Design a protein around this ligand. Structure first.
Ligand SMILES: CCCCCCCCCCCCCCCCCC(=O)OC[C@H](COP(=O)([O-])OCC(O)COP(=O)([O-])OC[C@@H](COC(=O)CCCCCCCCCCCCCCCCC)OC(=O)CCCCCCCCCCCCCCCCC)OC(=O)CCCCCCCCCCCCCCCCC
Ligand SMILES: CCCCCCCCCCCCCCCCCC(=O)OC[C@H](COP(=O)([O-])OC[C@H](O)COP(=O)([O-])OC[C@H](COC(=O)CCCCCCCCCCCCCCCCC)OC(=O)CCCCCCCCCCCCCCCCC)OC(=O)CCCCCCCCCCCCCCCCC
Ligand SMILES: CCCCCCCCCCCCCCCCCC(=O)OC[C@H](COP(=O)([O-])OCC[N+](C)(C)C)OC(=O)CCCCCCCCCCCCCCCCC
Ligand SMILES: CCCCCCCCCCCCCCCCCC(=O)OC[C@H](COP(=O)(O)OCCN)OC(=O)CCCCCCCCCCCCCCCCC
Ligand SMILES: CCCCCCCCCCCCCCCCCC(=O)OC[C@H](COP(=O)(O)OCCN)OC(=O)CCCCCCCCCCCCCCCCC
Ligand SMILES: CCCCCCCCCCCCCCCCCC(=O)OC[C@H](COP(=O)(O)OCCN)OC(=O)CCCCCCCCCCCCCCCCC
Ligand SMILES: CCCCCCCCCCCCCCCCCC(=O)OC[C@H](COP(=O)(O)OCCN)OC(=O)CCCCCCCCCCCCCCCCC
Lengths: 115, 175, 105, 347, 80, 171, 98, 318, 117
């Protein structure tokens, strides 16, 4: 309950710093000041062209390594178990498999960027 | 109407699903899936899964940041469809919303509904446990048991992530 | 092809997350532990064909523990009749269903 | 591909199939299917041309949609049963969704729309992996849920697969699309006998895998991917024309060959259950499969299409190929019918 | 083995520290006498209720009161 | 099905322990020492009956024995206990470690005036044996007759009569 | 059953029909598989947290893992479509029609 | 009276951001041999008020090519997620005492990237496009170690509760058992919070103003007062992790003064780093948090799993 | 200027060893304190369990004595009819207890712990 009140307050006086930022000053709209910025000159082409990602293999491997901190994250709670050598073996197995993954991505030049 | 809070968050969940399932553009698809995955960690957080909601929030935030980077790099067109640019996007968006609020209206007026299964219309506060779990949140204990009890599950999941990295680096080669 | 390697080799790969009545961490019971224990001890070894009709009652009690459909239907009937008697004015709620009751402990 | 990585990826495909076969938990079935798909995608993209990328995209989308429906069937089973055991399903909705998921994973019609595409796009070895080894894990799960499979659904899927896989191969000149529509018709034959006697399902699966592995090994040993390039085999290695003759006449269900063994036994188990119309329509519809098999035997063995001049150079070079188990599979796919009561070992 | 170790410490010292810390974390819990006490502390942490036993008549090891001398003790944790 | 059988409202009336949770947590170790026997009879009845309606009377003994625990604190050592549960009551997590001097004064005053030993680290988590005269419940799950299992296989395995009997195969 | 399962199954079906009806853009439907994983996550997790079957609480995490473990796969298969062709439109993937 | 407890949180940290701008400019001046603002107020104590009045009466300049809904929603969500990460921070008592407050911090750190990201996409400009996808390259770089460092330091805590991280550090600071994690976490929070040498999204020498190059004043203020709120919150979070102070339950103001002056010293350390180091290139950023910090972070994760089992020092979860 | 390499690594490893020793002592003390708090919980649990039993039986009897007054005109109704075939005790649902009470008690009883701060 108090969490939603706090988030409502934060969103409320973040959007009420915007509605008094647009509606308080005097507006002078003409169709050259609202043009895009290309250091004074007119922009050649749209910015909705495909801007090619060089770090794409690292971006896909980030999706896999971010799952590991959904698996390695219960370790403060997994240390509280009564089958503890098994827990320790499985924890070191998960960090070792992440490390073998990172070593394979290193040595096959997957961490480098293209071009 | 505050007892219906999980139901209200679930309405916002379906609204986000109609938002990205109409497929305007994967910018706004990522927007709608973030909104649905952020109210879905409020649906499931009211059942006791505070660990298990924050993770589906966080994993999908990383996921939609990656998907944003790809739909700015690969899936980009000159005039992206916002929600209303195409008639086929807006038509099925309005269709999903009207059918969703139609089955809202049929389940609050009648307190029962039937689409394939039968569903109650009372607030889902009714089905909670009337007891306490002591000095442990039980979902944290169950996810902590992934290391003590879930050893084979650890082995197959870690092997699947390892060969996922190997598989992806074998695909994205070209030669 | 159910090549039952787990019973041949005697290993427990995934028999532990199979049912709710299994060994749980810190002995945590499910909400339907007794119903599922009764259904499994009924239907053990008699096969599925005899289990679908000779252990029907325990499985109905267990399914109605899981989804609570008859309970929520009965509460729908009670709450709807209560709201109808409030709307007709032929019934008033007691003070312990309004708050002023100086609760038990 | 680096051969260590090829070994690890093929062992991971095998590991996914084994995890589906040996596990008693639904989440581990789903993990095995995910591992199987995830590992088999680079087997399809072994060559890195646009047809393998298209085939891998279509295969990923079909198998991912099927695995979504499979996990929804698993979660509805979890609701209506409170448990995870791989056995019969405790809801007809979950039964329908899991039967749809497994029918998509088998490529049974009307979910068949990926099997000729994906089979044509990928090499002959990965097409062999697709049409044989990927037909083992969904048939495991279908073998395990048959007390809950809807009769009308699996019989509609089965006869629709037999008819569509019969008519599809008649319009084909590419060998991989021929083997893919042959796959569709044979999975229809396997799933039609599933609720009556699943031992005959396993028998048809094993005889089909033997005959399909024989045909793909013959195609790889001859390096032929079209009908009209298979038709040059008499001028290069004339024993291979005899082997494709006996194997294609075996796959059509002709006696005294072993491919008559499953069909007949399936009829033998469907007439016991007072179904006479359905195995009759299935048998008559298998004549279409026999017809395009006979078309391939006409082009390859029984006539001699004109060859080229450069074939004279290939007379001077023998095959250095690993034709692994090709005489064993050729003998097992043709001369196994007198050993027909061996099927009792599959009980 | 020492010249290669000096070479990799000169070139990639972060990886040398990484494999050193990882090797210690692998081998050192198997060489410590205190790893037993971790398990003994974790199985002596009473989350659940110690559900009592019906006295049949012959249980000499089970006490009738918590302040009785028989039963499991935690003096090893008090001293350490 | 049947009518659920609940006790009446007069069956549930008992003199409650009307103290706060810090008052209970401050007196908790001496409560686990001195009020051992009816509490363990109750929790044994509670895990064996698996039904609170068959555990009311023993539960009343709990509510009989707790109050006599506090009156014996109230007659003798009311003020050091009052200071001790006040200091426990200040904290959010109600730490025992923030209140060791009032704990020492309370334990000293109790051991002098009443002769109670505070239980050490490890004692209150023991599994103890309970001598009751109530019968063991023969069916606490209210179960019924388990179905008769299928008959097993017996007899020596003879060969198959005339082989496989598959259409013409004589073996 | 309970009221929230109606809308979580409804969100599954909405994401199902969104996946199963392509709008000639492959990334917009790879979001729909991720939405189906989200809906399966929330549905299974509501069922598991409801019934206090605590040992299956590790199940949705594992489920979520394989979510991205195929989603990344799709993205690794999205970039090869978008390197052969300038766009990831699904109607460019029609070479295997012959 | 919880609404006052919210208004006594976010309003004093919309003032501490304002005077943080003055402290940033003056410490940046005296380290660059000049003086800062000392003209508007008494030695500059009204320059933040001058900027806060100037930015909200200037013409907002919504572009013609900009997707206006995401253009307005992105600074709102920026200041929203800047304010809402202050609620689980124990000062010694947090506003909202979460059982899993660390993961709330981590998830809202992941969500606050989308303000920068949708602001860079929505303003349809080529320089704001490059400043948008440099946030993707930065976020796939720090997040892959922001979680394992924060995992390994909580393996000595026992939970994800931030208030228990005061009880954890009651004898010694947790920087003494975890100084490699501390000196790696500090750089990870530099890379998270878009401070120099990891600016890289508002990278002024390359990109004229970066992702917010189209945001004129008013909406530019809510990215400028959000980032500074992120650095004060982030140094308070680093102080709670590694520099936990003495807590007297009867005198909370001693803890408040102590962690306040420690977090001020860490904010001055951020200003020291911004005024002294050359800025990275955003691939050399990625070959730092993946080739250097991630293997050693995995090694220290193995060590901080195995070490509480090795010494019988597993911390309690309660 | 500055120290050598070996001196700085020695100071760093010594700081590690001091931190590990101090956290060893303090986490062992914290585990002993946790066991003390849990045994206080255990000693309180019989009284809390007895009061919880009388609490839920009080609420079910109040929901039963008011079910017969509401359900009087309805034909064929069976007051207090179990929805289970067994006669075993079933732990009550949240709607079985707080189904006839006000929304303040409902919210404070079924979302109270989760929403609490
Ligand atoms: C348990 C179940 C076992 C099932 C059979 C498993 C083995 C066969 C299948 C595996 C396989 O691919 O084998 C490769 C296969 C050779 O591949 P190929 O391309 O078919 O061979 C072509 C040339 O023959 C290659 O010639 P080469 O130049 O390499 O030299 C000769 C080679 C040299 O090899 C050796 O010297 C091998 C030495 C090591 C042997 C292992 C010990 C270690 O020997 C052979 O090739 C002999 C013929 C092999 C026959 C393969 C099929 C065997 C029977 C399969 C089942 C049939 C069931 C019929 C049932 C009918 C009713 C249903 O066989 C071997 O390498 C060795 C076969 C050993 C058979 C043992 C059978 C009993 C096992 C118990
Ligand atoms: C002191 C201790 C040691 C003492 C040792 C004493 C003995 C020494 C010799 C031991 C070695 C065994 C020798 C043979 C034993 C007798 C087997 C026999 O004749 O069974 C008659 C068997 C049943 O006749 P019967 O009047 O009821 O009983 C007489 C016996 O008492 C039948 O007795 P049964 O009741 O015990 O028979 C069991 C059952 C009785 O039979 C049945 O229950 C009826 C159903 C049988 C299968 C029918 C399948 C029909 C559909 C497929 C047809 C495929 C195409 C046909 C052949 C085309 C050519 C490849 O047979 C089977 O289940 C086995 C299947 C048939 C295989 C027979 C053995 C062949 C070995 C040599 C293979 C050479 C190629 C043979 C042809 C390949 C196809 C089989 O006749 C047939 O099934 C018709 C086919 C003829 C049988 C094979 C002839 C063997 C000799 C061939 C020499 C020339 C080869 C030329 C080159 C290869 C061909 C191109
Ligand atoms: C939290 C409170 C504060 C904590 C301290 C932080 C304050 C100091 C901050 C100073 C300003 C920094 C500004 C940003 C600088 C960014 C650049 C940077 O730091 O790059 C990192 C640099 C990168 O160096 P690099 O980029 O030159 O690396 C070269 C790499 N190759 C060859 C591949 C090109 O260093 C590191 O990555 C080290 C990180 C910390 C290492 C900690 C090691 C601990 C000891 C390990 C064990 C050693 C003994 C062996 C085993 C013994 C076993 C018993
Ligand atoms: C169109 C674009 C969008 C425009 C609008 C943007 C709006 C603001 C978006 C940013 C805010 C997103 C919030 C996401 C949910 C956060 C949940 C949370 O704060 O959980 C933390 C905390 C966990 O504490 P716990 O361990 O449960 O301890 C209590 C148990 N004793 O939980 C608690 O302490 C429990 C307190 C009650 C929690 C109620 C359930 C969560 C409410 C979610 C509201 C909707 C979120 C919408 C997300 C949109 C994302 C863009
Ligand atoms: C009910 C459940 C029953 C389970 C039974 C399990 C039995 C074993 C598994 C059978 C399943 C199918 C096996 C074949 C899968 C495909 C293997 C494959 O593709 O291997 C690759 C390899 C390629 O050959 P190469 O020329 O080197 O390649 C050039 C570059 N690619 O080589 C090839 O492509 C050549 C073919 C090699 C394998 C064929 C032989 C095995 C299968 C035929 C039957 C063997 C008889 C025993 C088993 C009966 C049951 C199947
Ligand atoms: C057994 C214990 C557990 C081990 C596994 C767990 C590790 C946890 C830490 C995570 C590591 C993840 C990433 C590892 C990647 C290793 C591969 C690699 O990067 O090789 C390349 C590297 C040289 O880098 P380069 O080729 O130049 O790369 C281009 C950028 N410059 O090549 C090198 O730097 C050389 C690498 C080989 C030699 C390393 C020697 C370290 C010895 C430390 C002392 C002994 C420790 C005990 C273990 C035995 C080591 C042999
Ligand atoms: C029952 C069967 C129908 C269920 C859905 C009903 C609404 C959608 C059907 C309306 C027909 C228009 C349509 O959807 O066309 C397919 C469209 C792709 O077509 P496109 O290439 O964009 O446009 C050229 C052709 N108009 O593809 C799409 O628009 C895909 C988006 C569909 C999202 C559906 C969400 C609403 C809920 C559905 C039920 C749950």
């Amino acid at each position: 309950m108090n969490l939603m009140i706090t988030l409502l307050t934060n969103f409320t006086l973040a959007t009420l710093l915007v509605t008094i930022a647009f509606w308080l000053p005097q507006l002078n709209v003409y169709s050259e000041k609202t043009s895009p910025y290309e250091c004074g000159f007119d922009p050649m082409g749209s910015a909705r062209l495909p801007f090619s990602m060089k770090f794409f293999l690292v971006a896909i491997t980030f999706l896999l390594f971010d799952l590991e901190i959904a698996l390695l994250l219960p370790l403060p709670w997994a240390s509280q178990t009564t089958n503890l050598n098994t827990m320790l073996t499985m924890a070191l197995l998960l960090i070792f498999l992440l490390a073998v993954s990172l070593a394979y991505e290193w040595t096959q030049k997957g961490l480098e960027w293209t071009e | 109407m505050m007892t219906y809070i999980v139901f209200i968050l679930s309405i916002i969940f379906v609204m986000g699903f109609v938002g990205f399932s109409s497929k305007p553009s994967p910018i706004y698809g990522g927007l709608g899936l973030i909104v649905s995955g952020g109210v879905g960690c409020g649906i499931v957080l009211n059942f006791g899964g505070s660990f298990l909601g924050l993770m589906v929030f966080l994993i999908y935030l990383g996921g939609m940041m990656v998907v944003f980077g790809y739909t700015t790099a690969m899936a980009t067109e000159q005039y992206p469809e916002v929600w209303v640019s195409n008639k086929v996007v807006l038509g099925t968006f309005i269709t999903g919303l009207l059918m969703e609020f139609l089955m809202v209206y049929y389940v609050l007026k009648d307190k029962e509904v039937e689409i394939v299964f039968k569903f109650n219309g009372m607030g889902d506060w009714v089905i909670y446990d009337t007891g306490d779990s002591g000095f442990f949140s039980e979902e944290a204990m169950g996810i902590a048991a992934l290391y003590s009890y879930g050893t084979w599950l650890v082995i197959v999941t870690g092997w699947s992530l390892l060969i996922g990295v190997v598989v992806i680096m074998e695909i994205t080669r070209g030669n | 092809p159910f090549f039952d390697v787990q019973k041949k080799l005697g290993v427990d790969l995934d028999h532990w997350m199979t049912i709710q009545s299994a060994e749980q961490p810190h002995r945590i019971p499910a909400r339907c532990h007794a119903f599922e224990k009764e259904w499994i001890e009924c239907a053990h070894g008699i096969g599925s064909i005899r289990a679908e009709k000779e252990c029907k009652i325990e499985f109905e009690d267990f399914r109605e523990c899981l989804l609570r459909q008859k309970t929520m239907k009965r509460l729908n009937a009670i709450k709807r009749q209560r709201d109808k008697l409030i709307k007709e004015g032929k019934y008033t709620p007691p003070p312990h269903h309004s708050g002023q009751e100086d609760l038990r402990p | 591909m680096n051969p260590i990585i090829l070994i690890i990826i093929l062992m991971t495909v095998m590991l996914g199939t084994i995890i589906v076969m040996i596990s008693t938990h639904w989440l581990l079935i789903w993990i095995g299917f995910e591992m199987n798909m995830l590992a088999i995608i680079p087997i399809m993209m072994k060559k890195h041309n646009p047809r393998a990328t298209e085939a891998s995209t279509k295969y990923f989308l079909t198998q991912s949609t099927a695995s979504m429906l499979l996990m929804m069937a698993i979660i509805i089973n979890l609701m209506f049963s409170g448990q995870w055991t791989v056995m019969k399903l405790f809801n007809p909705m979950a039964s329908m969704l899991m039967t749809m998921a497994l029918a998509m994973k088998l490529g049974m019609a009307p979910f068949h729309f990926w099997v000729p595409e994906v089979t044509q796009g990928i090499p002959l070895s990965s097409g062999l992996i697709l049409l044989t080894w990927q037909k083992l894990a969904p048939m495991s799960v279908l073998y395990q849920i048959l007390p809950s499979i809807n009769l009308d659904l699996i019989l509609t899927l089965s006869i629709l697969s037999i008819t569509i896989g019969g008519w599809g191969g008649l319009n084909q000149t590419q060998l991989r699309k021929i083997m893919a529509y042959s796959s569709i018709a044979h999975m229809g034959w396997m799933t039609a006998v599933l609720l009556y006697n699943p031992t005959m399902t396993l028998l048809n699966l094993i005889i089909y895998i033997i005959m399909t592995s024989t045909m793909f090994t013959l195609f790889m040993a001859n390096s032929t991917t079209t009908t009209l390039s298979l038709s040059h085999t008499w001028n290069k290695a004339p024993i291979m024309t005899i082997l494709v003759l006996i194997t294609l006449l075996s796959m059509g269900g002709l006696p005294p060959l072993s491919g008559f063994m499953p069909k007949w036994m399936i009829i033998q188990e469907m007439t016991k259950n007072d179904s006479i119309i359905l195995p009759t329509l299935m048998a008559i519809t298998a004549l279409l499969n026999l017809y395009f098999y006979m078309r391939l035997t006409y082009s390859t063995a029984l006539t001699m299409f004109p060859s080229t001049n450069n074939m004279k150079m290939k007379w001077q070079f023998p095959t250095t190929k690993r034709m692994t188990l090709l005489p064993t599979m050729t003998v097992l796919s043709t001369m196994l019918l007198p050993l027909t009561p061996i099927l009792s070992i599959l009980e | 083995v020492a010249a290669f170790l000096k070479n990799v410490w000169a070139k990639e010292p972060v990886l040398v520290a990484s494999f050193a810390i990882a090797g210690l974390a692998v081998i050192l819990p198997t060489l410590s006498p205190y790893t037993k006490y971790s398990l003994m502390i974790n199985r002596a942490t009473p989350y659940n209720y110690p559900v009592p036993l019906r006295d049949d008549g012959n249980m000499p090891d089970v006490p009738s009161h918590p302040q009785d001398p028989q039963g499991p003790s935690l003096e090893w944790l008090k001293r350490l | 099905p049947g009518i659920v059988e609940l006790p009446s409202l007069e069956d549930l009336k008992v003199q409650e322990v009307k103290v706060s949770s810090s008052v209970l947590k401050a007196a908790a170790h001496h409560y686990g020492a001195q009020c051992d026997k009816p509490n363990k009879e109750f929790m044994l009845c509670r895990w064996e009956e698996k039904d609170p309606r068959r555990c009311l009377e023993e539960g009343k003994l709990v509510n009989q024995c707790a109050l006599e625990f506090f009156r014996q604190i109230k007659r003798h050592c009311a003020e050091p206990f009052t200071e001790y549960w006040t200091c426990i009551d200040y904290s959010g997590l109600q730490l025992f470690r923030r209140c060791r001097k009032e704990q020492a004064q309370f334990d000293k005053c109790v051991l002098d005036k009443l002769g109670w030993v505070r239980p050490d680290l490890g004692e209150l988590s023991k599994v103890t044996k309970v001598k009751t005269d109530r019968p063991l419940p023969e069916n606490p799950y209210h179960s019924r007759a388990r179905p008769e299992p299928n008959p097993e296989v017996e007899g020596d395995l003879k060969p198959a009569r005339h082989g496989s009997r598959l259409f013409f195969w004589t073996m | 059953m309970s009221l929230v399962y109606m809308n979580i199954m409804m969100a599954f079906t909405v994401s199902l029909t969104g996946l199963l009806m392509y709008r000639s853009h492959l990334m917009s439907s790879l979001l729909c598989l991720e939405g189906m994983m989200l809906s399966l996550f929330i549905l299974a997790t509501l069922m598991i947290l409801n019934s206090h079957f605590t040992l299956a609480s590790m199940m949705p995490i594992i489920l979520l893992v394989f979510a991205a473990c195929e989603a990344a796969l799709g993205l690794s298969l999205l970039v090869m479509v978008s390197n052969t062709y300038g766009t990831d439109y699904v109607q460019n993937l029609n070479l295997l029609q012959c | 009276m919880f609404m006052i407890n919210v208004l006594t949180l976010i309003i004093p940290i919309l003032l501490a951001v304002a005077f943080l701008t003055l402290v940033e400019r003056k410490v940046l001046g005296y380290m660059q041999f000049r003086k800062g603002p000392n003209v508007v107020g008494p030695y500059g104590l009204l320059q933040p008020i001058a900027d806060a009045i100037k930015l909200f009466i200037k013409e907002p300049l919504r572009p013609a090519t900009s997707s206006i809904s995401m253009f307005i929603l992105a600074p709102i969500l920026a200041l929203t997620l800047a304010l809402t990460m202050w609620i689980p921070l124990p000062m010694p008592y947090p506003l909202i005492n979460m059982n899993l407050g660390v993961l709330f911090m981590l998830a809202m750190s992941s969500l606050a990237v989308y303000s920068i990201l949708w602001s860079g996409w929505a303003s349809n400009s080529k320089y704001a496009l490059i400043g948008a996808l440099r946030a993707v390259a930065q976020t796939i770089s720090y997040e892959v170690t922001l979680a394992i460092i924060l995992l390994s330091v909580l393996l000595m805590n026992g939970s994800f509760t931030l208030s228990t991280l005061i009880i954890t550090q009651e004898q010694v600071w947790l920087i003494f058992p975890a100084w490699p994690l501390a000196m790696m976490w500090f750089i990870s929070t530099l890379a998270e919070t878009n401070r120099a040498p990891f600016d890289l999204t508002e990278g002024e020498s390359e990109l004229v103003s970066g992702f917010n190059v189209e945001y004129a004043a008013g909406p530019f203020a809510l990215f400028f007062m959000a980032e500074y709120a992120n650095i004060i919150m982030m140094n308070i979070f680093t102080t709670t992790l590694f520099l936990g102070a003495f807590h007297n339950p009867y005198m909370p103001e001693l803890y408040t003064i102590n962690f306040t002056i420690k977090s001020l010293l860490l904010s001055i350390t951020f200003l020291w780093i911004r005024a002294s180091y050359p800025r990275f290139r955003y691939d050399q950023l990625m070959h730092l948090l993946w080739k250097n910090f991630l293997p050693l972070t995995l090694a220290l994760c193995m060590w901080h799993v195995s070490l509480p089992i090795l010494l019988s020092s597993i911390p309690p979860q309660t | 200027r500055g120290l050598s390499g070996y001196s700085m690594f020695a100071v760093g490893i010594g700081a590690l060893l001091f931190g590990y020793w101090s956290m060893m002592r303090w986490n062992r003390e914290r585990r002993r304190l946790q066991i003390e708090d849990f045994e206080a919980r255990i000693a309180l649990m019989p009284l809390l369990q007895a009061e919880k039993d009388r609490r839920v039986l009080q609420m079910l009897r109040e929901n039963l004595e008011e079910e017969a007054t509401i359900m009087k005109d309805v034909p064929g109704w069976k007051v207090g009819e179990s929805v289970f075939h067994t006669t075993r005790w079933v732990t009550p649902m949240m709607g079985e207890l707080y189904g006839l009470r006000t929304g303040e008690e409902i919210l404070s009883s079924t979302y109270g712990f989760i929403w609490y701060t």
